[PDB]
Amino acid sequence: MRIVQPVIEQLKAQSHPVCHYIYDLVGLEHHLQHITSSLPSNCQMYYAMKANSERTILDTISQYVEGFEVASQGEIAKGLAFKPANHIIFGGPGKTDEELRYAVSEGVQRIHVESMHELQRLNAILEDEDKTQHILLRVNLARPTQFGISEDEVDDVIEAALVMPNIHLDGFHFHSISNNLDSNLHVDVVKLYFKKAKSWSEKHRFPLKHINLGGGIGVNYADLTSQFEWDNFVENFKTLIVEQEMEDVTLNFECGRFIVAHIGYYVTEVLDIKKVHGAWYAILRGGTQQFRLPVSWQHNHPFEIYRYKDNPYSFEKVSISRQDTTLVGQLCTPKDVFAREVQIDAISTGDVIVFKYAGAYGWSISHHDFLSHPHPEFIYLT
């Protein structure tokens, strides 16, 4: 509450309705400084902007990271606002000819190639433009997903890439795991990546210049006090690099969620409180079309309650105490739920709900214009 309370107090004092994203840019800077300085000299941090690509966020982040990871022409353009093309890396399973030509034209650092067909399409553009391109091969190690090259197929794609004079094969890209909260398990996964990369390098005798170790550094939305043990991970990661003799290989991570989640808040006023067939609901300004994370992940999103002491109406507020309460937005769908049957100690109409850990995949994944509501306002604290 400490960070958002002065903002909420000022909005209330100015008779300004509360439906806002609030971002702590000071906390973001401190978090980034800590993460990036802890890394060994051969390892780089790229920000995966899919988590949050708001211009002010990218402006702030750009100083502290090696570059941006992007997955479309639009993200390339957003990244180029603050980084040279040579510090943008481009992944994704469906890169169009238009996107590939744009990437090559601008001079993107690496393309993370996901198939033989993509390699051939990229190569045709390079031959046409008379340019060269550094790539990684994205590997899907042995569940079935659409991403990367199936482990069994990687040898053939390596061989193809090596004989294409316009392609420079730097190494491999692994992004297998999502939202891992276990730092020791993460070290064991990186070890697997190292061994697979070295085995392919040794089999095909090409220099292992670079490995992209992906993201998947998790955030805990169920228990906010039990986050990824980054310092533990980094110490053991450093040891692993020495044990596996990877000091002369450049490494990068591509993190989104872990960089921006905890510095964002979605704050919204209570419009109505009602009981329907025994179940209590609180209806909030905005909705899950502005903050879809709880619906997408099917969880009760963490929040606190700002208890507002004044009353703008001549009739009493609606208040409840110590009820299972379902928090919903303004939308006309029963799917518009931030939290279902959660304990609320006290809540009244006019109070403000402060949703925490809203900085990553909050606004970015949301169906902003469903039902044509005005967008929330954005406040960036410096």
Place this chain on the structure above:
Amino acid sequence: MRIVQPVIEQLKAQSHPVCHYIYDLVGLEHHLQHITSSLPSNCQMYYAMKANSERTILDTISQYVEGFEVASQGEIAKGLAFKPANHIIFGGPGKTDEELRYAVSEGVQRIHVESMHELQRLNAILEDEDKTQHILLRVNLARPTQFGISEDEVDDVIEAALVMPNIHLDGFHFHSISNNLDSNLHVDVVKLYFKKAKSWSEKHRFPLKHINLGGGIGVNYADLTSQFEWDNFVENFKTLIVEQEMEDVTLNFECGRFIVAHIGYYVTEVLDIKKVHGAWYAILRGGTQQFRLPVSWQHNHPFEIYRYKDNPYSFEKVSISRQDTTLVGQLCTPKDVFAREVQIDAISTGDVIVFKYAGAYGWSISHHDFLSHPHPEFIYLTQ
């Protein structure tokens, strides 16, 4: 395929990439003509624009329907571009003071009030503005949802409404059913609405002027030949009106899905075909952030395949036949799935997938700018 094929052919001949919403406005007009002309004189159709509020769609629809049902200030503003305020009806569980003041200022036809607190906030605005407003009370008949007034609380809100001189209580709004494909069940639900409205009207001694019977007329995405039997519904609905003596009560429906679903298509080219740990995937241009319906509803969306014979590259296409295949978009999440493990007769890179029945809750529910991809192009067919 007859409707979209000439559009796809033109795009291919012009070397334009295929990632489009295509709408058959002629089909839409014929559908609306049929629906609106079939209804009895005391019943009107309103279009619930949340299903699809594209301006060209609204313009076309406005020629046939009585009006628009809206649920936000943005939808009011869109509605007003194509209808006067006195043919716009405004519902939703969280109407802000700003929205209520806007609606009152413009003179919307009805506000469908969903709680005692909303009634009090609306009344405070009306007293401040020296204006009056016709309302319905939205009722949640005895599952818990956030919508409307719980049945056992309706008596108290009626009495509060009748005592407020700035409020004109016209009657009731019921919208409790969702995607119903059974026409006879739908008649039985309307029967229940009629009896409840009459009981409250008689108990509280005010004239029942109007009932909003809601939407929830379904569309079948699993079996496209088995749609809602509208003519059967209307015939029995007309009989029910006479049977229940509702001829002097005005009625409306507020349908979205049923009006626009079948006349929209989401069309996209195949960018890649790959096998990963035994499973085949076709990667399409665009994604479920442009057409989220298959993901939201967790189904395999109906589609057809248009084959393109030409090869624009100097290297070979990827071609497969008779494989169970998962169709995905360009996004970086394993959730970006249009259809899972569906048998495909034959498909190559460069071919086009035509997703049918994409007109309702297609673009309107989608997270358009996630990963910052260019929007699809929109084509509206008038011939």
